[PDB]
Design an enzyme around this catalytic site. Structure first.
Site, PDB file in Angstrom:
ATOM      1  N   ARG A   1       0.841  -1.209   0.000  1.00 52.80           N
ATOM      2  CA  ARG A   1       0.000   0.000   0.000  1.00 52.80           C
ATOM      3  C   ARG A   1       0.876   1.260   0.000  1.00 52.80           C
ATOM      4  O   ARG A   1       0.553   2.258   0.676  1.00 52.80           O
ATOM      5  CB  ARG A   1      -0.979   0.012   1.189  1.00 52.80           C
ATOM      6  CG  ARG A   1      -1.945  -1.247   1.211  1.00 52.80           C
ATOM      7  CD  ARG A   1      -2.726  -1.207  -0.139  1.00 52.80           C
ATOM      8  NE  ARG A   1      -3.873  -2.131  -0.107  1.00 52.80           N
ATOM      9  CZ  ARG A   1      -3.817  -3.440  -0.362  1.00 52.80           C
ATOM     10  NH1 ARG A   1      -2.658  -4.035  -0.646  1.00 52.80           N
ATOM     11  NH2 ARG A   1      -4.932  -4.147  -0.327  1.00 52.80           N
TER      12      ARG A   1
ATOM     13  N   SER B   1     -11.529  -2.123   2.243  1.00 49.63           N
ATOM     14  CA  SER B   1     -10.863  -2.300   3.509  1.00 49.63           C
ATOM     15  C   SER B   1     -10.452  -0.929   4.019  1.00 49.63           C
ATOM     16  O   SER B   1      -9.636  -0.290   3.395  1.00 49.63           O
ATOM     17  CB  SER B   1      -9.621  -3.190   3.334  1.00 49.63           C
ATOM     18  OG  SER B   1     -10.055  -4.533   3.203  1.00 49.63           O
TER      19      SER B   1
ATOM     20  N   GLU C   1      -6.215   3.182   5.548  1.00 49.47           N
ATOM     21  CA  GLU C   1      -5.760   3.163   4.163  1.00 49.47           C
ATOM     22  C   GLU C   1      -6.534   4.187   3.279  1.00 49.47           C
ATOM     23  O   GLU C   1      -5.993   4.719   2.301  1.00 49.47           O
ATOM     24  CB  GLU C   1      -5.960   1.750   3.663  1.00 49.47           C
ATOM     25  CG  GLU C   1      -5.465   1.484   2.304  1.00 49.47           C
ATOM     26  CD  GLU C   1      -5.679   0.035   1.949  1.00 49.47           C
ATOM     27  OE1 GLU C   1      -5.994  -0.264   0.760  1.00 49.47           O
ATOM     28  OE2 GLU C   1      -5.544  -0.806   2.873  1.00 49.47           O
TER      29      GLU C   1
HETATM   30  C1  LIG Z   1     -15.350  -2.341  -2.916  1.00 47.76           C
HETATM   31  C2  LIG Z   1     -13.876  -1.970  -2.915  1.00 47.76           C
HETATM   32  C3  LIG Z   1     -12.918  -2.998  -2.906  1.00 47.76           C
HETATM   33  C4  LIG Z   1     -11.550  -2.693  -2.885  1.00 47.76           C
HETATM   34  N1  LIG Z   1     -10.621  -3.731  -2.935  1.00 47.76           N
HETATM   35  C5  LIG Z   1      -9.281  -3.400  -2.953  1.00 47.76           C
HETATM   36  C6  LIG Z   1      -8.304  -4.411  -2.974  1.00 47.76           C
HETATM   37  O1  LIG Z   1      -8.600  -5.643  -3.022  1.00 47.76           O
HETATM   38  N2  LIG Z   1      -6.996  -4.041  -2.994  1.00 47.76           N
HETATM   39  C7  LIG Z   1      -6.591  -2.714  -2.955  1.00 47.76           C
HETATM   40  O2  LIG Z   1      -5.399  -2.405  -2.927  1.00 47.76           O
HETATM   41  N3  LIG Z   1      -7.516  -1.718  -2.914  1.00 47.76           N
HETATM   42  C8  LIG Z   1      -8.881  -2.066  -2.886  1.00 47.76           C
HETATM   43  N4  LIG Z   1      -9.803  -1.041  -2.833  1.00 47.76           N
HETATM   44  C9  LIG Z   1      -9.310   0.381  -2.716  1.00 47.76           C
HETATM   45  C10 LIG Z   1      -9.154   0.993  -4.108  1.00 47.76           C
HETATM   46  O3  LIG Z   1      -9.896   0.225  -5.046  1.00 47.76           O
HETATM   47  C11 LIG Z   1      -7.736   1.234  -4.613  1.00 47.76           C
HETATM   48  O4  LIG Z   1      -6.972   1.985  -3.682  1.00 47.76           O
HETATM   49  C12 LIG Z   1      -7.697   1.963  -5.948  1.00 47.76           C
HETATM   50  O5  LIG Z   1      -6.356   1.922  -6.451  1.00 47.76           O
HETATM   51  C13 LIG Z   1      -8.104   3.449  -5.911  1.00 47.76           C
HETATM   52  O6  LIG Z   1      -8.433   3.886  -7.230  1.00 47.76           O
HETATM   53  P1  LIG Z   1      -9.226   5.281  -7.490  1.00 47.76           P
HETATM   54  O7  LIG Z   1      -9.160   5.390  -8.983  1.00 47.76           O
HETATM   55  O8  LIG Z   1     -10.601   5.206  -6.853  1.00 47.76           O
HETATM   56  O9  LIG Z   1      -8.373   6.331  -6.664  1.00 47.76           O
HETATM   57  P2  LIG Z   1      -9.021   7.502  -5.837  1.00 47.76           P
HETATM   58  O10 LIG Z   1      -9.787   7.136  -4.619  1.00 47.76           O
HETATM   59  O11 LIG Z   1      -9.802   8.401  -6.798  1.00 47.76           O
HETATM   60  O12 LIG Z   1      -7.703   8.306  -5.414  1.00 47.76           O
HETATM   61  C14 LIG Z   1      -6.815   7.714  -4.474  1.00 47.76           C
HETATM   62  C15 LIG Z   1      -5.571   8.561  -4.316  1.00 47.76           C
HETATM   63  O13 LIG Z   1      -4.739   8.580  -5.500  1.00 47.76           O
HETATM   64  C16 LIG Z   1      -4.557   9.908  -5.958  1.00 47.76           C
HETATM   65  N5  LIG Z   1      -4.650   9.818  -7.436  1.00 47.76           N
HETATM   66  C17 LIG Z   1      -5.749   9.365  -8.163  1.00 47.76           C
HETATM   67  N6  LIG Z   1      -5.407   9.383  -9.482  1.00 47.76           N
HETATM   68  C18 LIG Z   1      -4.142   9.858  -9.622  1.00 47.76           C
HETATM   69  C19 LIG Z   1      -3.323  10.054 -10.750  1.00 47.76           C
HETATM   70  N7  LIG Z   1      -3.715   9.819 -12.019  1.00 47.76           N
HETATM   71  N8  LIG Z   1      -2.065  10.519 -10.549  1.00 47.76           N
HETATM   72  C20 LIG Z   1      -1.598  10.776  -9.277  1.00 47.76           C
HETATM   73  N9  LIG Z   1      -2.413  10.598  -8.184  1.00 47.76           N
HETATM   74  C21 LIG Z   1      -3.653  10.100  -8.349  1.00 47.76           C
HETATM   75  C22 LIG Z   1      -5.730  10.653  -5.356  1.00 47.76           C
HETATM   76  O14 LIG Z   1      -5.481  12.022  -5.347  1.00 47.76           O
HETATM   77  C23 LIG Z   1      -5.927  10.029  -3.998  1.00 47.76           C
HETATM   78  O15 LIG Z   1      -4.895  10.480  -3.152  1.00 47.76           O
HETATM   79  C24 LIG Z   1     -11.147  -1.353  -2.847  1.00 47.76           C
HETATM   80  C25 LIG Z   1     -12.079  -0.322  -2.858  1.00 47.76           C
HETATM   81  C26 LIG Z   1     -13.447  -0.630  -2.875  1.00 47.76           C
HETATM   82  C27 LIG Z   1     -14.454   0.509  -2.836  1.00 47.76           C
END
Ligand SMILES: Cc1cc2nc3c(=O)[nH]c(=O)nc-3n(C[C@H](O)[C@H](O)[C@H](O)COP(=O)(O)OP(=O)(O)OC[C@H]3O[C@@H](n4cnc5c(N)ncnc54)[C@H](O)[C@@H]3O)c2cc1C
Length: 340
Positions: A165, A234, A329
């Protein structure tokens, strides 16, 4: 009708907690040039900017007074060696869609990451992982818009400094880099990774599809779909403690569940929360989901305050039962950027 700034935009469509809230300004970026105009030009130099993908790792905690920038840069290009497949994926691509695409193309190696919500560009930020695979394992490179130069730079997987992470985009490159695309690399001699949860029932000569179906099946069973009940997955990371620290813990709690880590032991927070007797615990509209106790869910009317107090309550109880301090997280957003 692109690069239209939305003023006073409701944020529910933009993050998976689905909490009622709005942004002073919001815009959808669709190309490298849009991000370049948004971040490296005099126009909109006035507003702090928060880049988001699907807001699936985010909690808005009050009126967002900056400009939200929604990453929808699209494109998947594919090529292949004698030895590898390589993909160049635009940062806005939907992740669960991308894994389904690989699987349907017969490209093996992404399938344990099935159905993780998010954009391909966000994948490296927290080095997403599940069922024993992490983004760093399939990563060739990451490309980003360098906020200082206004040009696109490239990091090898090594230079991303991936950890559990974690990555360089949460440190040195925090707020200096907007990821614009991800290079993925997969060996043509595919090896199923099949040691976690229900994948253990599979056998080592199964097909890509076999693994993918199982991952989808389990996940759709255990994790609430956020369009039904909002959540961010999570809520805490699994804490990583020394071996000795773990052995100490394990004297009082011989039952405690562990996961592999190179440095010390990773302890299953789901298990900690569940034994602490927190399953189903509610504050306001926020609840610990009984089928996967790391996931705080919005039962319909949660405020960010609910989620935050429930997180505080869980953390408290967990520290008391085990002397362990859970680290959130999910990113907490204030008026402009992250808090505490
Ligand atoms: C139902 C569910 C299940 C999940 N399961 C997992 C899992 O199994 N494993 C896991 O690791 N995570 C899991 N997650 C968490 C999540 O899916 C990941 O962290 C994912 O990578 C976040 O993607 P996002 O596009 O929503 O980022 P966002 O929530 O939109 O942004 C997250 C962060 O990244 C920054 N950011 C976004 N895009 C960029 C970019 N292009 N350049 C630089 N910075 C950027 C943002 O500013 C923010 O700080 C889960 C989430 C949900 C809701």
């Amino acid at each position: 009708t692109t690069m239209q700034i939305q003023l006073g935009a409701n944020l529910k469509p933009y993050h998976t907690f689905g909490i009622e809230q709005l942004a002073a300004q919001l815009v959808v970026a669709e190309s490298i040039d849009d991000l370049k105009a948004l971040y490296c030009s005099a126009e909109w130099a006035s507003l702090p900017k928060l880049i988001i993908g699907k807001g699936s790792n985010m909690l808005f905690t009050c009126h967002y007074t900056g400009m939200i920038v929604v990453n929808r840069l699209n494109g998947i290009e594919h090529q292949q060696d004698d030895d590898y497949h390589r993909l160049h994926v635009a940062g806005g691509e939907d992740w669960p869609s991308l894994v389904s695409w690989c699987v349907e193309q017969g490209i093996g190696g992404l399938e344990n990451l099935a159905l993780i919500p998010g954009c391909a560009g966000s994948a490296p930020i927290q080095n997403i992982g599940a069922y024993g695979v992490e983004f760093k394992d399939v990563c060739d490179y990451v490309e980003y818009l360098c906020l200082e130069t206004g040009t696109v730079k490239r990091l090898t997987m090594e230079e991303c400094q991936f950890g559990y992470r974690d990555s360089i985009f949460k440190h040195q490159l925090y707020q200096k880099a907007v990821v614009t695309a991800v290079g993925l690399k997969f060996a043509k001699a595919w090896q199923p990774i099949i040691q976690y949860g229900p994948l253990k029932d599979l056998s080592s000569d199964c097909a890509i599809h076999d693994v993918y179906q199982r991952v989808c099946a389990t996940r759709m069973e255990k994790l609430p779909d956020p369009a039904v009940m909002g959540n961010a997955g999570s809520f805490f990371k699994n804490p990583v403690i020394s071996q000795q620290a773990f052995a100490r813990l394990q004297i009082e709690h011989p039952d405690v569940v562990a996961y592999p880590a190179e440095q010390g032991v990773k302890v299953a927070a789901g298990w900690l929360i569940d034994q602490a007797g927190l399953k189903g615990h509610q504050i306001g509209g926020a609840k610990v989901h009984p089928k996967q106790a790391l996931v705080i869910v919005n039962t319909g009317d949660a405020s960010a305050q609910d989620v935050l107090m429930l997180a505080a309550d869980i953390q408290q109880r967990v520290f008391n039962c085990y002397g362990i301090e859970l680290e959130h997280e999910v990113r907490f957003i204030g008026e402009s950027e992250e808090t505490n």
